[PDB]
Write a protein that binds this ligand. Structure first.
Ligand code: HEM
Ligand code: HEM
Ligand code: 7LN
Ligand code: 7LN
Ligand code: H4B
Ligand code: H4B
Ligand code: ZN
Lengths: 407, 411
């Protein structure tokens, strides 16, 4: 019932009680653990509503005040009547913040309470959605001094009228197969890239073509829009000691901004809720650049370094990996765009886990995702026991809208 | 019920039915995953079914299920349990059991090798001096002048819980740790405590940085005894680097034979509390963990100083640069002295083939992703992108408490 988590580097032991609030299921049972698996009515809504407003009013020291009872009353009235309800702005902000706070896979959560929330529930069209988004991009980019933020579109109603951003992130590079049979650009986005072509995006057919946004208001067919290049901050990647590096022609974008998730607050579903912060270096240099099914450049960098690529045991892949990641960080830092290294981020997240154990009674944490994809054991998250569990409010996955939409 | 696991690099999907044979608990529930937690006297009552399951498995492994020999063995085991309260395994069943404990080890990345395990039967052993002798033969067989061979030795099983065979050391070969008055540690910090027990018991400590610990061996519930392994049997490797000549001047070395001595082997309900086993090293175990953990030899600073990296900011990645060089050194040294070792690219690639083959022949392969993925360069090994399923099968290897915490001293 009360659970203990140990850090095996520092012997610090934390006690977790927060998990007893866990409502949703994990995928695991007593027989099988599924921790490495990437994805596992009016009746229903009031319970969810009450659960949320109770924790909101608790959070503001008014649990069991007339204001609380009245809201519980007012929302209850509104559900029985409309079959849904609306959040006050204050509830909205709290709920989005808390959905970040509860994201068990996010290493960046020491920041959870600095989130700018843009309320876009008044939006009706894709052109609206485009406006709101470009404003979010520009706010968040802040000429390189990046700021956390989320833009929230109207909540689901009967599910024939969903708002969706079809892009997986607002800012991502094009992917194209060639007769050749290999891939030009980013292979992760091949299918979406051809979706945009199929809608009429004239494609530069380059390595690093920023994709057009494809936006669906109110359940309609979605529409293309080019984010103004002036709003897309990009970084050329060079190395602080290897002059040839820049001639690999690498660049990446400054703002990571996820746009395909579903935000659940108090029973209500916000199918479009794009959010951004900034990058931990390894996301780019280890994952986007080196993954076999991504830009997959390790071979070519190793060549330029003249390393012995005959044997895996020369650790040439690993040598190249480090230098790439030095280059990503150096470039961002040189250009003054915010970025965090994996050492600093995980040091941060351990400080934060400790805060949340102390103030909240725990912290859901998914070790599989929290531990970076390079140098695992030399970051402190490696030696930290974590408990994973699901709290609401929450971000959740949802199915790619092309597999669901009707034209 | 059928379960699928996908690999996200290759889109290979696998199907799991083997987990239906799982009975032991994970620690997880529908509401909490415990997957990163390091660690989440039997009566006749519980013993016969455990014995029966095991022999049903042993007998289908040899294609004699339902056979007369299968049935007669059940009746013989059963009658022995209820007359003697326990039972003895035949040689063949002990072999098969130890092989399957490895095979069922979901945290082992080297299970490709499962079927090649030399099983020494030390169940005629009565005394500690007997134990030393069996261990020494193990260590010489397994070492094989640097051409390592996997082995396990299996002392008598538990009876009343008061006559246990234990090996007190955590590995058969490990370096001493000495906490100094100034609060620093000389040698290996992980073995400080055990080192302290050994001194108390009588060991004169050379007090250096790489002293091989003596064996501390309990037979038959008796107080344990101190033995020195013959150094001629302890194969060790000086660590040097192929380009950096100053590397050797750091004075590093390490032993070549990894051999776990503190786990409990369970086969058919039986508890074999001393079952040292040995294989060979994945390079990262030494290069990443043993040398560069903060709580172990912690050499990262001194390597990066010699390399004159920019240590003023973490974002130089001066740690990740030092870590790689040290790992290159460890693999280079071992290959140059012709001691078996495997790097983490090659070990993980082999595992992924093992794991697919197993899904095909066996219907599954329990696997602990937190453990299988190496502590450096995670995502550029193929295991990082492999979804795995973790569940527990018997026969199996288990943790047990350190014996100095439970042992009843006689004097
Ligand atoms: C401010 C700096 C931030 C940093 C440095 C950061 C860091 C990360 C990283 C590295 C991941 C793993 C991503 C991957 O491997 O694809 C992650 C996952 C995630 N973060 Fe953040 N984060 C930050 C801000 C945010 C914000 C503002 C939110 C929400 C408002 C958020 C919500 C998430 C969620 C939901 C996931 C997991 C998504 C999934 O399950 O696939 N993070 N975070
Ligand atoms: C032959 C070469 C072998 C290699 C390269 C190998 C590799 C590994 C490695 C790297 C680990 C993780 C160790 C750690 O993080 O401390 C491991 C775990 C393990 N392997 Fe092996 N292994 C080998 C042979 C064996 C043998 C012979 C057995 C037993 C017969 C065995 C049983 C285990 C067990 C029980 C674990 C997990 C222990 C725990 O939970 O603490 N392996 N394997
Ligand atoms: N085939 C896939 N499909 C796939 C199917 C289902 C789920 C996923 C999970 O996608 C994540 C993989 N790393 C990517 O999510 C993007 C993300 C989310 C949150 C934070 C991220 N990075 C940041 N710094 C932030 C973004 C927004 C605020 S901070 C990135 C992927 C692949 C995944 C990885 C390689 S292939
Ligand atoms: N306090 C601890 N003690 C501790 C307490 C309980 C469990 C553990 C886990 O033990 C392993 C830690 N890595 C040590 O196991 C050594 C091992 C086991 C199996 C295979 C290994 N390597 C080989 N290649 C083989 C050994 C024998 C056959 S193959 C090494 C450790 C710590 C953990 C982390 C920091 S301190
Ligand atoms: C199969 C495995 O769970 C999957 O590859 C995970 C592993 N850990 C990860 N961790 C992060 N942070 N991001 C990821 O995309 C993944 N991939
Ligand atoms: C807390 C966490 O589970 C612990 O640090 C684990 C992580 N993964 C590991 N993986 C292996 N192979 N060996 C280990 O000792 C550990 N330590
Ligand atoms: Zn689990």
């Amino acid at each position: 019932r009360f659970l203990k988590v140990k850090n095996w580097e520092t012997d610090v032991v934390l006690t977790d009680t927060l998990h007893l609030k866990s409502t949703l299921e994990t995928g695991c049972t007593e027989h099988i653990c599924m921790g490495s698996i990437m994805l596992p009515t009016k009746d229903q809504l009031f319970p969810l509503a009450k659960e949320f407003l109770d924790q909101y009013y608790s959070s503001i020291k008014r649990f069991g005040s007339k204001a609380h009872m009245d809201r519980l009353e007012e929302v209850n009235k509104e559900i029985e009547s409309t079959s849904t309800y609306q959040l006050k702005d204050t509830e909205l902000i709290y709920g989005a913040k808390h959905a970040w706070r509860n994201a068990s896979r996010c290493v960046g959560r020491i920041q959870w309470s600095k989130l700018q929330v843009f309320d876009a529930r008044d939006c009706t069209t894709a052109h609206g959605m485009f406006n709101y988004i470009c404003n979010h991009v520009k706010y968040a980019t802040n000429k390189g001094n990046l700021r956390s933020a989320i833009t929230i579109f109207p909540q689901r109603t009967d599910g024939k009228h969903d708002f969706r951003v079809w892009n997986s992130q607002l800012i991502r590079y094009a992917g194209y197969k060639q007769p050749d049979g290999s891939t030009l650009g980013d292979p992760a986005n091949v299918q979406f890239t051809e979706i945009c072509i199929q809608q009429g995006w004239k494609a530069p057919r380059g390595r690093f073509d920023v994709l057009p946004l494809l936006l669906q208001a109110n359940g309609n067919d979605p529409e293309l829009f080019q984010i103004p290049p002036e709003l897309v901050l990009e970084v050329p990647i060079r190395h602080p000691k290897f002059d040839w590096f820049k001639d690999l022609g690498l660049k990446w974008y400054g703002l990571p901004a996820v746009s395909n998730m579903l935000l659940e607050i108090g029973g209500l579903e916000f199918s479009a809720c794009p959010f951004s912060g900034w990058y931990m270096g390894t996301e780019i240099g280890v994952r986007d650049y080196c993954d076999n099914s991504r830009y997959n450049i390790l071979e070519e960098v190793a060549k330029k370094m003249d390393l012995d690529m005959r044997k895996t045991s020369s650790l040439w892949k690993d040598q190249a990996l480090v230098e790439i990641n030095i280059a990503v960080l150096y470039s961002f830092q040189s250009d003054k765009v915010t970025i965090v290294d994996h050492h600093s981020a995980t040091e941060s997240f351990i400080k934060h886990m400790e805060n949340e154990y102390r103030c909240r009674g725990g912290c859901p944490a998914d070790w599989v995702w929290i531990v970076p994809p390079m140098s695992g054991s030399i970051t402190p998250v490696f030696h930290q026991e974590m408990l994973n569990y699901r709290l609401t409010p929450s971000f959740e996955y949802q199915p790619d809208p092309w597999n669901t939409h009707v034209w």
